[PDB]
Structures are given as structure tokens and as C-alpha cells.
Structure 1
């Protein structure tokens, strides 16, 4: 009889989500968790926090998972702060809450579904190895996450049995005044056929404009960007070179209601297993004001047990940093027209391309041998 809440934002198929939640069966776990579907707009984060507190104080609610159609990380940060303050378990299905923060709180209980910084680098290295690439470059902005990802990629490539050729590393800062000439002069020193870029959208657009002004971006250039460089596949800045390769989250094939129902069922099963094993259920005063004395009942057992859960023949165990062990990723490619096309999908460190020969964009002759 654990209180589970579900909040939605914007337009969404509430009937399908309700049917998926009602179709869930947890007779073996004997959790008997209730469902509470509540709709909310995008007014402000304070209103969302007030609604979350009201839902928690409504009828012994011990958990809530919300989804938003926006993309601002401020909502996810406020949700993580509220979860750390109230010491309650909260999860993010998709949307703005699906963003992976860099530094999580120590005394917090939060879990999200998505890939990590090292997972994207590993996927990029696997794609480069599959594409017969043996040379690359390192270029990033002054962001700390990009520098950390570059350092992790360098540490992973250092302890590699196969060969590797690193030309140089670029750490130019675009925030300086009148520093475009120095950046353009330093960009000409690049000679490798592949270059990696990890920055924001505006920084990526500026780098692409500088590369187009230099002229080494038409034929003998290969640019690789992370999932945070694109953000929205529907919108294109019309300044990126054709043929760019970047990774992204599997959202076109994964269904939001089915994933939400699976996550709710996994959370209910984990809560039932914890209540059966530890024989302790945390049910404190779910209030908003005067929450300093609410930390008398420690909830570290629920957070430690939530990193190990499985249901319906699937693995949903998280990590110590708050990231999924086996995430779902896809490969995107740039065609002649501005659009994003699915090239391949990777899962459990296993690549699966939809073409044996990679499309190159008269040369490229075919030679037969016996």
C-alpha cells in the first residue's frame, strides 16, 4: 500500500498511461501501490514544488515521477533539490528530468534513465573503430564537462592494446574579446582527418563557421559531436557541415507510456522487496515547511536497495553516480537536406549498423579478387 504518484506536463495521452498503469501486475511482490495521475502546466517551479508537496501530504505518498515537454535543466535541478530536501525517492521518465547532471548531491536519493559521459565516449570510440578510423583530434570549449570527457577519453585510449595516433589537443576559449583571430590561426594547425567537438550549440555553430571560413571542412573533414551539441533534431542551425556524425538518446522507438509503466512497476517491486527484507517502511510527515527535524528517520536503505532491481526480464540497476548501467542509444547522420536519420543502434556495448558499406559523401572504385 505504497503511495505512487504520476505527474504529466503539456499534452499527453493520459488514457494510454492510465491503461498501462492499470495493466501492471504486482501480485508476487504484494506491493499493491496506488496510482495517482495528476496534470500540471509549465507555470513555474514553485507551483510544481507546491503541487508535489500537496500530493505527498495527500494520502501517504512515498514517491512521484514527473515528465515535462520542455528542455531546461532548471526544472530537473529544482526536482533534484526537492528530492534531496524531502529525502523522498523521485525519478525522471523523459524530457527535462532526463538530463544527466554533472555533480550529484551526496545525501540525495535520485535516479534517472540515460547515458553517462564515459558511455558516449565509448560509443564514439566503437563507431570509429568500426569505421576503420585510426586518427582523431581533441577540441573542446572551456566547459568543465567537456574537459572531463576529453580526459576520460584520453585515459581510456592510453591503456589500449591497439594502436592510436593523437595529433594535439585544443582548449581555446570563445569568451575572450577579439580572440577570434587567434582561434582561427590555431585551428589551421589541425591536420588529422577526424576532429571531435564537445561544446554548446552556439559554440558549435561558431566553430563550424570558423571551419567554413578556414576552408578545411568540405571533403577531408570528419566532425564528431556529443548528444548535448544537437539537443533538438527537428531544428537545424543550417551552419553545420554535411555528413556530421553524432550520438543521441533512443527516443523515436522507445515509448514514453510503456517506459513509465515499466519504471513504476520496477520501483514498486523494489519497494516491496525492501519492505519485506529490511522490515522497515519510511512513512514520515510528508510536509514542506519545517523539514529540518524530518531527517530523524534515515532513508539510506531505500536508496541503497534501488540500485538493484529487475522486472519483466530487464535490467534496470543504476550506478553510484546516478546513471543507468545499460542505456539505449542511437546513431544519427546528416543527409543532403536538413534532417536527422537513424543509422544504427547500440545496446549492451554491442553495435548494430543497418548497412555493411558506409555511405561516402569518379572515385570509390570496386576491385574484384580471387
Structure 2
């Protein structure tokens, strides 16, 4: 008898996307949507147009794009309209610095902290004590740096960080201040924290200094790569990164997990609270106060013996991550598999 409306928006991808591609007591309604452009006005308008009278409470979003801006848009919309949003693939799943407590936006991507921790585990596994840090002013660099500095504090093991260099990408490069800052680099391992375009320009700059040459191995978060299919030509060979499982974890499976999260959260508050105005501008029904309990319940989700539970920062708690390495043929190969506790 009870039924809830959900909208699934997929953005045009190079890969074949078929709209035709355990239901819980609460009955989900799936609205299939295909979009051409990932731009903010397109996203906001289509989402607000898809709303209409359809009365969709849940929203599933994913993209093939490399744009980290999508997560900011989605978080802005979720924060503004007090509506659940789940980033699934690509740009929507990338990382931000700090989200408001009122924000219901959650991503399937790994937390920046856990990314840096995994990176440090890579450094430990290959036993690299000597390293360097290059970060941009993009959101989250403070978190990243602070995680490396956090780990180097309580370790009885030998650790040395030679440099932490923060590049400002807000200004155009003429004076080559980026070059001058990057040429000061020495250590064999350089931690680069930045977006994909930033990673491209910075890696392009590093070539003049020769930091992409042998003896230097770069260890990077999931924020830079984010797509194993599309590889920039400016990316140095031997680049180590962390990626969410693709072959192992399918894109339709992700959306499934999202609907599972939503439905399970709605069912959790069904047992607890025992009991949906849809539009952009405002809601006379209020209910914003009851939305918080729904969010809190949306945080903790147990499904199929696997926890999809999210984190307070907005990211996923313990997603499966695989360490990848860019080979001579310029394709991403998996050099590792990192679980909850053990490291492979």
C-alpha cells in the first residue's frame, strides 16, 4: 500500500547506458532520466522540472563527467531544499571540504582522510619514509595535510616530510610561481592533492622540473583520477592512485545501493516515528524538522551483510578501494586491494 517516488538522473556517457536496466515493504517508484549536459543550470532546471507534480522524495544522481563541481551543485541543492541526494558515479562522487550539518547530501566516494591514510599505507608497503606534499587551495587540502601530519605524530616508526607546498590556482600563471615552488621539490614521493584539471596543469609544470622522471613516484587520492577510462596525456607514467571498484562494483549496482539506502532509511523511521511537499521555492507543509531524523537514520544502513553507512563528513564509511598504477601503455592497472582492516 505505501509508496514513495524516486528520481534517477543519468548523464550522457561514452559507455552504453540503458534505461531498461528485495524491494522492501515500502514501494519505490523509479523515474528514468537521461541528460545531455552536466552544467549547473541544466542540472538545477532538469531536477526542478523532473519534480513537477511527480512528488519525488528521493533522488539518485550519477555522472560520467570529470567535474568535481557536480558534488558542490548537488550538495547546494540538497542543503537548500532539504532533500536526500546520493552521488553515485564520477564527478558526483568526488570530494568537498566541509558540508553543513543540515546537508543531507551523501557520496559513495571515500573520505579524504581515508584516502590519505590509504596513500600512507602505500608509502609504508613500499617503505617510503621520505616524501613531499603539494596541495592546491581546493577544498579539503587542509584535511589531507592535517591527516599526514596527524599520522606522523604518533608513529614510533621513522618518518620524514621534507616539504609541504600550497599552490594557488586562483591566479593565472605568468611569473611561473608554480614552477618556482615546484622546483624546490626533492623527495622521491610527492603527495599531490588537487582536482583533475589542476592535476593536469601541475603535472605539465612538473615536467619542466623533471619531477615526473624516474626516482620520483607520485601518490595521489581518488579526486585526481576518478575515471579509469579517460586518462589525460599530461599524467606521469608510474602514477599511483586510489580508485573505487569499477569492474567489481557496477554502476547499476550503485544506484541499487542508493535506492536501498533511501528505502531502508524510510523504513527505519517507519518503525520509530510511525509516520512530502515537493517544490523548489518553499514548502508550507514544513516537515523540515522531521527531515533530520530521516537523515540520522540515513546515516546508518545495513544491507545484504554489507554496510552502506555514510560518514558525518558526507562520504561513505568503509567502501572497497583498489590501488591503481598507471603503466607504460598509459592505462590504469590495479596494483592493490584495500579492505577494512587487512591491506592487500
The 5-angstrom pairing of residues 104-253 of structure 1 reads 104-173=99-168, 175=171, 178-180=174-176, 183-215=178-210, 217-253=212-248
The 5-angstrom pairing of residues 179-328 of structure 1 reads 179-180=175-176, 183-215=178-210, 217-279=212-274, 281=275, 283=276, 285-291=277-283, 294=286, 297-328=289-320
When structure 1 is superposed on structure 2, of 116-125 and 169-178 the one drifting more is 169-178
Who is 1:35 aligned against?
Answer: 29
Q: Give the superposed CA RMSD.
A: 2.7
Q: State the Cα deviation string for residues 164-202 of structure 1 (Å, max 9, x = none).
A: 12222223446365432x554554443322222223444
SS of alignment partner, residue 29 of structure 2: coil
SS of alignment partner, residue 344 of structure 1: coil
Q: State the Cα deviation string for residues 303-360 of structure 1 (Å, max 9, x = none).
A: 11111111211112212111111012111112222211111121214321xxxxxxxx
SS of alignment partner, residue 346 of structure 1: coil
* Separation in 2, partners of 1:73, 1:189: 29
How many residues were matched structurally?
Answer: 334
Question: Are residues 243 and 287 of structure 1, via their aligned partners in 2, closer, same or farther at CA, if it must alter by over 3 Å?
Answer: closer
Structure 1 or 2, whichever has the larger Rg, is 1
**Deviation of the 1:109 alpha carbon:** 1.9
* Separation in 1, partners of 2:64, 2:173: 36
Q: Which of 8, 14, 18 is matched with 1:13 structurally?
A: 18
Who is 1:88 aligned against?
Answer: 83
SS of alignment partner, residue 149 of structure 1: helix
**Deviation of the 1:120 alpha carbon:** 0.8
* Separation in 2, partners of 1:345, 1:165: 26
Question: Are residues 97 and 2 of structure 1, via their aligned partners in 2, closer, same or farther at CA, if it must alter by over 3 Å?
Answer: farther
Who is 1:53 aligned against?
Answer: 51
SS of alignment partner, residue 70 of structure 1: coil
Who is 1:64 aligned against?
Answer: 59
Who is 1:339 aligned against?
Answer: 331
Question: Are residues 168 and 298 of structure 1, via their aligned partners in 2, closer, same or farther at CA, if it must alter by over 3 Å?
Answer: same
Q: State the Cα deviation string for residues 87-109 of structure 1 (Å, max 9, x = none).
A: 23232332333233322133222
Q: State the Cα deviation string for residues 251-271 of structure 1 (Å, max 9, x = none).
A: 232112223223323321221
SS of alignment partner, residue 45 of structure 2: helix
* Separation in 2, partners of 1:96, 1:202: 13
* Separation in 1, partners of 2:332, 2:28: 40
Who is 1:358 aligned against?
Answer: none
Question: Are residues 294 and 42 of structure 1, via their aligned partners in 2, closer, same or farther at CA, if it must alter by over 3 Å?
Answer: farther
Q: State the Cα deviation string for residues 232-283 of structure 1 (Å, max 9, x = none).
A: 433444333321212222223211222322332332122112111222x3x4
* Separation in 2, partners of 1:184, 1:196: 16
Answer whether contact 1:2 1:62 (CA < 8 A) is retained. Answer: no
